[PDB]
């Protein structure tokens, strides 16, 4: 199995991990901050997804330094993962296009 496929495969795994970990850590970091809503795990996971995909609807978000730091890591991993998938696809199309040209 080529690397772009294997990497794309890994990116997925790590992303899911980042989501779970970021969910856990967001709660740990936000409880204790008056008025924070990112304090229960189920909605904390939803928040992590909507952040990683960059949808960010605005229903939930961190107010503390650490919550925002955790948030950045989720953002980055999310943009990179989906972005790496794009890389793999391009690589996939390139290879086959070369073949289609007899190369």
């Amino acid at each position: 199995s080529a690397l772009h496929w294997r990497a794309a495969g890994a990116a997925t795994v790590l992303l899911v991990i980042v989501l779970l970990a970021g969910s856990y850590l967001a709660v740990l970091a936000e409880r204790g901050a008056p008025g924070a809503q990112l304090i229960t795990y189920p909605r904390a996971l939803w928040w992590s997804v909507i952040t990683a995909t960059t949808v960010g609807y605005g229903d939930l978000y961190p107010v503390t330094l650490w919550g925002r730091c955790v948030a950045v890591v989720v953002m980055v991993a999310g943009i990179t993962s989906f972005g790496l998938v794009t890389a793999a696809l391009a690589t996939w199309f390139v290879g086959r296009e070369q073949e289609r040209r007899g190369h």
Partner: antibody
Amino acid sequence: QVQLQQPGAELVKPGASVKLSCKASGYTFTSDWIHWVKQRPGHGLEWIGEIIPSYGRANYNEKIQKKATLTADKSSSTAFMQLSSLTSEDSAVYYCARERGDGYFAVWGAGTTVTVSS
Amino acid sequence: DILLTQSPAILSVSPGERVSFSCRASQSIGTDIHWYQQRTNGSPRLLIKYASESISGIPSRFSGSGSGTDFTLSINSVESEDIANYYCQQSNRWPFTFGSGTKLEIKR
């Protein structure tokens, strides 16, 4: 079986401190939070604080005078609440509770009636 | 800090009659509300979670409803054993808070 075991009573002289416990049994998860609730005779329930055993962090009520200090023992599955420099004003029932990190108190301990007298 | 107002503080109802307790949050909180029943000398016990979700062990007689700011805990055909104090509790914003409570009195 009783998920949370709490001592029946604790007599404390004014100015002294006491350390309440809360033995936990049953299913346990890294996302569990143990809350403490004060209730004086004839009155409502007051949120005192909380702590997450898996990590060891605890938060407290900012609307009241901090008298408690929460700790946890992962090996013995026991949560402790240190109350210090108590006065009659601190005489009440202190309940411990378990929240699966989803916002509600699924189970409460029987409660420890603390009396502050000489 | 969300203020949960429970009024009236006491509710007199006749046997087998329907009753409804009220709990109003100072601000909107979706359906992040939990109801507890505490009998004389008894420890608090969860009745309804997230405004209307049932709980195992609890009688189908108990029901919940509402969203936003106004929540209601209902009981169809109240019987002697329902006598106790009732509290709502929010988990929408930190820190979690409790309503002052409503006592249920039965007029036999």
